[PDB]
Amino acid sequence: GCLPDWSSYKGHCYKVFKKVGTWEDAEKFCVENSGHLASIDSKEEADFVTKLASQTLTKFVYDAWIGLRDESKTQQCSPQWTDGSSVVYENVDEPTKCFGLDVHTEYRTWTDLPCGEKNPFICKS
Amino acid sequence: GCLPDWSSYKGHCYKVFKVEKTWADAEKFCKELVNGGHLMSVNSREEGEFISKLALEKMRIVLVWIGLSHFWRICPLRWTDGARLDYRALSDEPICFVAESFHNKWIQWTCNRKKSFVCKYRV
Amino acid sequence: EPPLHDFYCSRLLDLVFLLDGSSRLSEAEFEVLKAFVVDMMERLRISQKWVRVAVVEYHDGSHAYIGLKDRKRPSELRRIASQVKYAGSQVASTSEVLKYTLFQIFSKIDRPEASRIALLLMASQEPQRMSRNFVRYVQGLKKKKVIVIPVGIGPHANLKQIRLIEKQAPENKAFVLSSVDELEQQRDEIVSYLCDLAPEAP
């Protein structure tokens, strides 16, 4: 349907890339292909991208970037403390605001991850 | 400054507990312990270094629960293609935070796992 | 050989001591670590019918000094532990050692009655490259019912890996000590927990 190196489904075209890249870069590339990092809506399209990812990244040692992130202005996303204090200052050793298919569950689960961790990704057009 | 066994620092009082409790229980413990007491909150770099020295020095503790946590259906999660996240393929379990008394970094950690903590109340 | 100290865990247990061999520990600190292994062993009914013991010093690879099937005198084992040579390597791959523990130490559960525990005494952080299969090994253990007790020592422990372990199961209770000196202190709280995970000879 789409490009040979891709796979069509429900008026959308996906493809898993073995080459790594930050969540940022991964998207800058998906866009360069007239699209974005894969986005899941249905549970159907979910297990699909799971297989699609499972079939391609046969080795299971890497997480695959998807198009979900935390817009939060802050390091972590909790806006208030337990004491009612507003979360102004922070010191999270390494905030994780970019999600990707969890490889430790066979790509069926989503896991937030450090944006900047070079993982393979999935594009959708 | 404060009352016995609690250390004083800028209008506040902190006490480190080695008892090792869960996050939700440690917080509950700080509340039913002192009127207006809570699980320690860090609003500055100097306050965090005060706690670490307190926890590391007088008790040699490396990890302590901090009053910071949340669930994912609370964050502003958005996609890049435009869709609106309704299909939550993300664990509903909450994220919790521990502080390490060495460098003062905050680390996400499973909530239902016992960890020594620090309580905090205002005089 | 009779019980040295009052703390005398006497239940079915297969405990594996894995000792960080990196230079994140001075030579003297390693001795304090080795001293810890001996103290523990002085609180276990180390028999082939009660508590079997294994000691491994890992670095680039893993070197076993004692195996669970080593039918020697309980005093002879502690002597071996006390004489464990100091590596001081640059890297101490926890992955390499847990792989060893999973594919060699507990390659076959021939003691189904006893509990399997891996006391992972770690004081450093392996380079992100050797951690490729880390989780897969930790998971493998969870399947073999090999409890893994991550013990963090000093300021260089992994913590990320420690947390990962403590996340697989609740039994993998973690201990994050300020230094090796904290080994003497929390030694008993550890043996009690370790013991309470083992069955009981009927």
Curated annotation (Swiss-Prot), chain C:
Disulfide partners: C9-C195
VWFA domain mapped to chain residues: 14-190
Protein name, entry field: von Willebrand factor
Organism: Homo sapiens (Human)
Whole sequence portion shown: 1264 to 1465 of 2813
